[PDB]
Amino acid sequence: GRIGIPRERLTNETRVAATPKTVEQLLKLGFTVAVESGAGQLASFDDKAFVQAGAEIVEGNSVWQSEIILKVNAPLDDEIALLNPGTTLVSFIWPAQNPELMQKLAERNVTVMAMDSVPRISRAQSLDALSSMANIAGYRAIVEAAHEFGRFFTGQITAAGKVPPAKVMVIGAGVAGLAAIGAANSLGAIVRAFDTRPEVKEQVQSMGAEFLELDFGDGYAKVMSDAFIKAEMELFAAQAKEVDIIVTTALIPGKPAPKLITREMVDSMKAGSVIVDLAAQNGGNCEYTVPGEIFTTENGVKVIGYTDLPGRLPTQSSQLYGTNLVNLLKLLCKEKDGNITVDFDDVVIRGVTVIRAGEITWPAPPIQVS
Amino acid sequence: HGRIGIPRERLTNETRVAATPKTVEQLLKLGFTVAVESGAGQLASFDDKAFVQAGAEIVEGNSVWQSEIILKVNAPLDDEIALLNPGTTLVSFIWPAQNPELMQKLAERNVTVMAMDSVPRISRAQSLDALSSMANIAGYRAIVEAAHEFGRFFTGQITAAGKVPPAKVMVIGAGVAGLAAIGAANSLGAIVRAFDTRPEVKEQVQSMGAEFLELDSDAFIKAEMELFAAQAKEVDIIVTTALIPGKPAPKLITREMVDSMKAGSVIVDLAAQNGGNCEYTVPGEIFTTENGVKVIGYTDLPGRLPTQSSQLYGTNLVNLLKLLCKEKDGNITVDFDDVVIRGVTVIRAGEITWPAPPIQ
C-alpha cells in the first residue's frame, strides 16, 4: 500500500497534498509514503521534514509508481500517462466542467476520487476540502485587504487624534464570507454582511457583524425576481459609498460569477478603498476585476482579484487539505492495514468516486436514506 | 500672509503628504489659508478634489512656495531651498545633526525652520511628536507585513480538519512601535511575548495580554542574547524595534538564531534604517534565508500606510501650529520661553538656534 505525493506542477501552485504531520497519520493507517523531492518546498516543508515524519524521498517520476496518488490539482496532460492501471488518484477534478479530463483518466484504468465532489452532509465535514479552502480564502482576503489598505483597520486613540475603525462589507456569508467577517471583526472593523439566505442571520450576528436587510412565490423565485435584484443592487450601491473594504464571495462552480458590484458603484467609493473579489476565478463579482491581478481604478480603488488565495497561505492550506485526504483514507481503510476498500454503500465514498476501475461513476445520485 | 503651502514630496518613493482634507479644515480654523500643489496627496489617496472640498486652493508650480508657511514631510532639496522666500516658516523633518550643510543653506534663505524630529519628548508635546506617530504606524504595519508574508493563520481556530494553534510573536523593544506591534498581533489572535530593557514597560506589556519575558554591560548582553536564542526556536514571528539610543542598531538577532527557526517564520526588522537588529537584514528588502525565514527590512513602513501616516503627521503639524497661533488669526508667533517651541525651532529668521540648551 504505497501512497505517492508528487510535486504540484500546475504553474505557480505552492500547496502539497501532505505535510510531515499528515504523513505520520498516513503511516498509522498502514500505508507507506513516498514524497517527490521538492514537493513541500513552497509550503515550507523541506525533504528532511518529510523523512523525519517517516516518508521516503524519491526523484523524477518514481512517485507515480504507487498504489495511491494524493494531489491538490488534477494531473496535467503529460502526467496522465504516468498513471498505472489500478492506481487510486485523489485530487480536485471538477468532473462537470472537464469531460475531456474525465475521458483521459478513464482510459488509464484507475479509480479517481474528486475532492470537489464530497457530499455536503454533516458526517463529511472533516473531509470537505472545498470548505477547508474557503475558510482559508476568507481569512486571507482580509490579510490581502489589510496589506493594500493605506489606513488602520483598527480604531484607536493616539496622541495625534482618534482614528475610526475601517468599515467592511462582506457579500455572501457562506464559508469564505464568515471567515472574512471573523478576521475583519478580530481587527476591530465595523463589519456588515449581506446574504440572500435569511437563516444565516444569527451566525453573522454572533460574529459581531450587522446583517443587512433589503428595502423591498418561493424563496428561489424571490431572489431571482427583478424587484429583489433591484433592492440588492441599491443596497450595495449605498454601502459602497460608506465602507472602506468590500469582500465578495458569490461563486458557484462552472457558472460565470454574478456582477454585483458595478463600475459605477466602485467609482463612488472613497479613494484607497479595497475590494477583494473571491469570485475572480469565475469572472468576479466586481466589473473592474482583472483575475490574477490587482486593478487600481481611476478614483484610486484597489480591486484585488487573485484566484489563488489558499496558495498564498500555502502551509495552512496544505495542512488542512492534507488532513481532509487523511480523513477520506480513514473511511477507505477501516482496519488500518494499507488496503483501500472503495465501498459504494457509504454515501461519501460514492459521492467522491467519479471514476472506478476505468468506468466513470460520476455523477452520484441524490442522497436518499431510510 | 497666513498662507500655508503643501508641496508635493520629491524624495524618491515618498508616498506621504504633510496635510489631509481633514487637517486642512483645521488649518482654516486657525485663521490660515492653504495652497496644495496638485497631486501632493495622490499616493496617500487624497485627490485634488478632496483638498478643494476641504477649502484649499490647488496650485501648479513652485506657486506653492509663495506661502508664508510651508509644511512638508522631508527636508527640502537644493532646488527647493532656492525657492524659499525670506521670512517663510518651514516645518518638516530636518535632522540637523546629520545635515549641517542643509542647515546652512536654509539659514541663508533667512527663514524659520521647525524640525519635527527635534520635538522634546515631554508629555505635553506628545500631540506634536511626529516620531511617535510614525513609530506607532510602523509597529502596526510591521504586523500587517508579517501576516501578508506568513504562510499560516495568525489566528487560532477550530476547524473540521483540525484545531490550528495561534502564531507565536516575540516583539523586541516595547517602546511606541513595539507596543503597536503587540496590539496588532493581539488583534489577529496571536500569542505575544515581549522583551524590553526598561522594566517600567512591564505593566503596559502585561495589560495587553502579552508575556513580559525575564532574563537569567556584558553579563546583561549575553543573557539577553541567550533569551532571544531560546525564543527564536519557539516563535513564528519576531518584530524587532530597538533603535536610536543615539547610534547604529544593536545586533540582537544573529544569523545563528535565524537559522534555528522553523521554516516559514517571519522577522520584521524595524531598525533596518540603522543597519537593523537582525544580522540577515538587507535594508529596503525582504531576504529569505536558506532555511526559509523571511527577514523583512523595509525602511519605509509609514510610507506603506500612507493615508494614516499623512493624517497623524498632518495632525502633529496642526498641533504645532495651535501652539504658534493662539489667536487663530493666521499668525505665527515663536515663544522661546516654551521649551517645546525652543526645541523644535532649529532656525529662527536666518539664525541657527539648534542645538537648544540642555533639558531633562
Ligand SMILES: NC(=O)c1ccc[n+]([C@@H]2O[C@H](COP(=O)([O-])OP(=O)(O)OC[C@H]3O[C@@H](n4cnc5c(N)ncnc54)[C@H](O)[C@@H]3O)[C@@H](O)[C@H]2O)c1
Ligand atoms: N513623554 C512621553 O509620554 C513619551 C511618549 C513616547 C515616547 N517618549 C520618549 O521618546 C523616546 C524614544 O521613544 P520609544 O519609547 O519608542 O523608544 P525607541 O524607538 O528609541 O526604542 C524602542 C525601545 O526598545 C528599547 N531597547 C533599546 N535597546 C534594547 C535592547 N537591547 N533590547 C530590547 N529593547 C531595547 C528601548 O528601551 C525602547 O523602549 C523615549 O526615551 C521616551 O522617553 C516619551
